[PDB]
Amino acid sequence: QCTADTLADAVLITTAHAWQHQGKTLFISRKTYRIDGSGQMAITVDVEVASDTPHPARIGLNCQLAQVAERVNWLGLGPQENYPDRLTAACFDRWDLPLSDMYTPYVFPSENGLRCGTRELNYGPHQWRGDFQFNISRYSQQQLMETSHRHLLHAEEGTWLNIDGFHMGIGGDDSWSPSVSAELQLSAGRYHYQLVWC
Amino acid sequence: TEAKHQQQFFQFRLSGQTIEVTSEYLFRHSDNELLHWMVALDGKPLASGEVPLDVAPQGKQLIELPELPQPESAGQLWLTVRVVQPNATAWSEAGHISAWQQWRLAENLSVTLPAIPHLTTSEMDFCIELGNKRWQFNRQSGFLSQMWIGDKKQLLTPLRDQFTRAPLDNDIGVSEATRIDPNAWVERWKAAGHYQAEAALLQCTADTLADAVLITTAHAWQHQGKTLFISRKTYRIDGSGQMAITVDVEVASDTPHPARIGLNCQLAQVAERVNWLGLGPQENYPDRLTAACFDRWDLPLSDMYTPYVFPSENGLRCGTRELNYGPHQWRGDFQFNISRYSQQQLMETSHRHLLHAEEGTWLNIDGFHMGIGGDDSWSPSVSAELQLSAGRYHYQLVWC
Numbered sequence: 049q050c051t052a053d054t055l056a057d058a059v060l061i062t063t064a065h066a067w068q069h070q071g072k073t074l075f076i077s078r079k080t081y082r083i084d085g086s087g088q089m090a091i092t093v094d095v096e097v098a099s100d101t102p103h104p105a106r107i108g109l110n111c112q113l114a115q116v117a118e119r120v121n122w123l124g125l126g127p128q129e130n131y132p133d134r135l136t137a138a139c140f141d142r143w144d145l146p147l148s149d150m151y152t153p154y155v156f157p158s159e160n161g162l163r164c165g166t167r168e169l170n171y172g173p174h175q176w177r178g179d180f181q182f183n184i185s186r187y188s189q190q191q192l193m194e195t196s197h198r199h200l201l202h203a204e205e206g207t208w209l210n211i212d213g214f215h216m217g218i219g220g221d222d223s224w225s226p227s228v229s230a231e232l233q234l235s236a237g238r239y240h241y242q243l244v245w246c
Numbered sequence: 247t248e249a250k251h252q253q254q255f256f257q258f259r260l261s262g263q264t265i266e267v268t269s270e271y272l273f274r275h276s277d278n279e280l281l282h283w284m285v286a287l288d289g290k291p292l293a294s295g296e297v298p299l300d301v302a303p304q305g306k307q308l309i310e311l312p313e314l315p316q317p318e319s320a321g322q323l324w325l326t327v328r329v330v331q332p333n334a335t336a337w338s339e340a341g342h343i344s345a346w347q348q349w350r351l352a353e354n355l356s357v358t359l360p361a362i363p364h365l366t367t368s369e370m371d372f373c374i375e376l377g378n379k380r381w382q383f384n385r386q387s388g389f390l391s392q393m394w395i396g397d398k399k400q401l402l403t404p405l406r407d408q409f410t411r412a413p414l415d416n417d418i419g420v421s422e423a424t425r426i427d428p429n430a431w432v433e434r435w436k437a438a439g440h441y442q443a444e445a446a447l448l449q450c451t452a453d454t455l456a457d458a459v460l461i462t463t464a465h466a467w468q469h470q471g472k473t474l475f476i477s478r479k480t481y482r483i484d485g486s487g488q489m490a491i492t493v494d495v496e497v498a499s500d501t502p503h504p505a506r507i508g509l510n511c512q513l514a515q516v517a518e519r520v521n522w523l524g525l526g527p528q529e530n531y532p533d534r535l536t537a538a539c540f541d542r543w544d545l546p547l548s549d550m551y552t553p554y555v556f557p558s559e560n561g562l563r564c565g566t567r568e569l570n571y572g573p574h575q576w577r578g579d580f581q582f583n584i585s586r587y588s589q590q591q592l593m594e595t596s597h598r599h600l601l602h603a604e605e606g607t608w609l610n611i612d613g614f615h616m617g618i619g620g621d622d623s624w625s626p627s628v629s630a631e632l633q634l635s636a637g638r639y640h641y642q643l644v645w646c
Contacts, residue, residue, distance in 0.1 A: 049359065053455045060455075066357050073355040094642075099322060099353040179638065231631075238579065240640040242494075 058084040074101050091243040093213065103234045105159075108180070108212030109243070112188070116207055117172040120150050120184055124166030132181075133217030133232055135164050147207070151185040157192040157201060161185055162215060171209070177244040181212045213241025247528055251537035254345035256299075256329050262351075265309040265327060269301045276301045279344075280330045285314055285351065287321045288523055289542040299329065320356035324540055325349045348539050361485050365452060365459045372452045374459050374483055381483060388447040388463040390481065395573065402606045403512035407465065407477045407495075410440050411505040411559040412592035414618055421624035431626060434502040439469030441593075448476075458484040474501050488646040493613065495639045503634045505559075508580070508612030509643070512588070516607055517572030520550050520584060524566030532581075533617035533632055535564050547607070551585040557592040557601060561585055562615065571607070577644045581612045613641025 049064040061081035067074045075097050082090040095107050126138025127145065129152050152160040161183040169176045171184060186203035189210070195201050217232030256279075259266040265283070269276055279299035285292045292315045301307040314323075328346040331338060363376040371391075372383040380394035389404040411417075413432040420427050427433060435441060448464035461481035467474045475497050482490040495507050525535055526543035529552050552560040561583040569576045571584065586603035589610070595601050617632030 051456075055453045055460075056451075060460075066355070073357050076355055076357070096355060098355050099350050 058082050072098070072101075074098055075104070087246060089245040091245065093239075093241050093243070095213075095239040097234070097237055097239070099237055103216065105216050105234075106210075106212045107214045107234060107239050107241070108210055110189075110208070110210050112204070113171070113174070113207045113209055114205075115172045116147075116186075118147060120145055120147055121170040122163065122166055122182075123168040125164050129161050130164055131162055131218050132164055132215055133219065133228070138164070140165060147184070147186075150183065151187070153198050155198055157187075157195050157198055159183075159189065159192065162212075164215070169211075171207070173246075175246055176211060178242055180241065180243065181215050182210060184209050211243060214239055248534050248537040251346070254329075256301075256345040258327060258345075258347040260325065260349045263311045263314060265311065267299065267301055267307045267309060269303060269305055271303045273303055275303065278331045278333050278335070280332050281309065281327060282330055283309075283311065283325065283327045285323060285325050286541065287317060287319065287323060289324075292317065292323075314351065316352070318354070320354045320358070322353045323351035325351050326539060326541075346539070362457060363459045363483050363485060365454050367452060372450075372461060376483065376485065376487055379487055381481075381489065383450070383452070383461055383463075383481070385450050386447070387445075388450040388465060398514075400514055400574075401511055402514050403510075405509055405511040407445070407467075407475075407493075408508050408510040408589070408610060408612075409443070409467070409475055409504040409506060410435065410589070411616075412557065412589045414558045415556060416619040416623050416627065417505075417558075419624050419626070427624075429626060431502070431505075431628070435505070438474065438501050439472075440474065440502070440504060443467040443469050443474050458482050472498070472501075474498055475504070486646075488644055491643040491645065493639075493641050493643070495613075497634070497637060497639070499637060503616065505616050505634075506610075506612045507614045507634060507639050507641070508610060510589075510608070510610050512604070513571065513574075513607045513609055514605075515572045516547075516586075518547060520545055520547055521570040522563060522566050522582070523568040525564050529561050530564055531562055531618050532564055532615055533619065533628070538564070540565060547584070547586075550583065551587070553598050555598050557587075557595045557598055559583075559589065559592065562612075564615070569611075571609070575646045576611060577646070578642055580641065580643065581615050582610060584609050611643060614639055 049062065051062045053060045064076070064078045066076050075095060078094045080092045097104060121144045123142050125135055125140055127143050128138065130138040150161050154160055162181055163183065164181040166180055166182055167177065169182055185208055187201055188204060188208050191201060214234055216234050217228045219227035221227040255270045257268045257270060267281065276299040281297045281299050282294070284294040295312065297309050299307065326346065326348045329344050331342045331344055332340060334340045361376060363374050366373045369385070371385055374381045378396050381390060382392040384391040384404065387404065389406050391404040393400040417431045419430040445465045445467050448466055449462065451462045453460045464476070464478045466476050475495060478494045480492045497504060521544045523542050525538035525540055527545060528538065530538040550561050554560055562581055563583065564581040566580055566582055567577065569582055585608055587601055588604060588608050591601060614634055616634050617628040619627035621627035
């Protein structure tokens with residue numbers, strides 16, 4: 049579905065998508081975009097996950113921004129990278145770091161640089177507000193998946209932004225068997241989050 | 247029933263498509279035991295069978311189910327097993343159920359898709375028509391105040407948010423009659439003003455979409471100038487007559503976590519039966535639902551009330567996808583209780599024999615509900631993960 053309506057003081061966009069693999073519906077996403085007279089775009093997301101599929105790594109949004117800014121400013125957890133499994137050391141405050149500090153250069157590339165518990169994120173002219181986890185870097189998730197050494201990574205044209213309502217734990221009791229505790233898995237079946245852009 | 251389920255002498259493990267049964271008996275072989283199994287989409291049964299149990303003390307038996315059906319219709323498949331004693335004993339009758347277990351099998355997400363309601367606005371109300379149905383939103387209060395089918399009214403009390411419950415004995419938690427406790431949940435709720443919080447209207451706006459009417463409201467519950475909770479709701483009435491309700495609630499981090507987050511109304515009708523698709527058939531709570539089974543349940547309205555001698559919050563059913571009272575249907579993922587007694591009357595009445603049925607039927611629908619505790623009844627005993635401690639909450643309801 050993709051439907052647009054003009055309210056008294058806003059424009060309402062309603063969409064719905066189904067992610068499918070070989071005839072089986074894995075996830076369903078329903079979104080409303082509300083653009084008001086103050087220029088802000090409020091995004092509401094509701095997601096249903098099939099109970100028989102493995103719980104997903106994350107639930108969130110992803111885009112590649114054209115601009116490349118020098119600093120990332122945000123109100124959330126810690127200066128350093130932190131995950132729902134590994135955030136007891138991070139502190140809630142206003143943090144300012146260069147864009148390079150938002151990427152952790154693990155020798156074997158992988159998902160990295162997430163910051164949880166974030167209420168506000170500033171990058172260039174843009175501002176996002178809500179309660180989300182984010183990472184921001186010059187490398188897409190696909191490139192990190194495909195590249196076996198950090199020295200072979202190449203910065204992309206713009207900056208990749210992932211904003212997640214929910215993120216699964218990282219585990220770590222051992223690295224040769226599943227070790228993410230049951231309560232850190234994305235097993236709720238239904239999920240909801242909200243985001244305001246600019 | 248929760249005690250019976252947790253203490254049962256057979257334990258079950260499912261590794262598709264094999265049920266592994268483990269006996270916790272120390273001395274006796276399973277010679278009076280028959281395993282029944284059933285697969286349902288909603289119940290709505292699809293398949294069933296019977297397997298005799300032949301397991302040694304502390305032994306194991308693998309039970310291979312035949313090819314399970316794979317319907318293309320949307321919905322969740324559930325497997326239920328029960329151990330039945332076919333022969334009577336000195337202490338039980340033929341057919342006694344001694345153990346059971348349930349699992350989720352396979353889900354098919356619904357991917358399919360589905361006159362224009364007329365909105366009339368006055369300075370006191372927003373009033374919507376569709377054919378023979380009418381909804382009335384009081385613009386001063388911001389709540390749905392009346393609903394019509396034909397010419398008959400459906401509500402005696404407006405549909406409003408509820409954040410409190412009539413305190414359980416675990417909530418009162420004062421062992422000696424003279425030793426008052428400021429740490430009891432009921433005392434914290436009273437001191438914070440949860441039972442006296444007044445709702446202040448923040449916004450009430452109506453818009454006419456292409457095929458629906460959109461009502462947006464917002465309220466703030468305050469006690470001596472301190473905002474406790476904020477509720478933001480959207481009501482969407484479409485051309486099929488259904489009203490979709492979306493609720494987002496923010497809870498102040500410094501207030502005690504509320505007993506519940508949900509809605510409450512008094513219906514005019516008094517029907518004889520309650521039919522729901524969820525956990526049952528008995529009363530069950532987020533703390534105490536391991537014994538309840540997901541199925542289609544039908545009970546008289548009197549069975550929806552547990553007559554505790556000291557009145558309190560009672561009769562909740564969790565994990566509910568659909569609820570059918572007389573003419574109405576509610577769909578979502580919620581907990582509900584339904585009875586002839588309001589929460590206020592249960593709070594104020596000290597003996598069950600002094601309760602009097604009210605004019606209509608009180609309905610509480612909760613997105614979220616606190617645990618009941620029970621490790622002891624003289625200190626707080628609700629674990630941290632069954633408390634409503636998240637800052638923000640969201641739930642969705644369809645009223646048809």
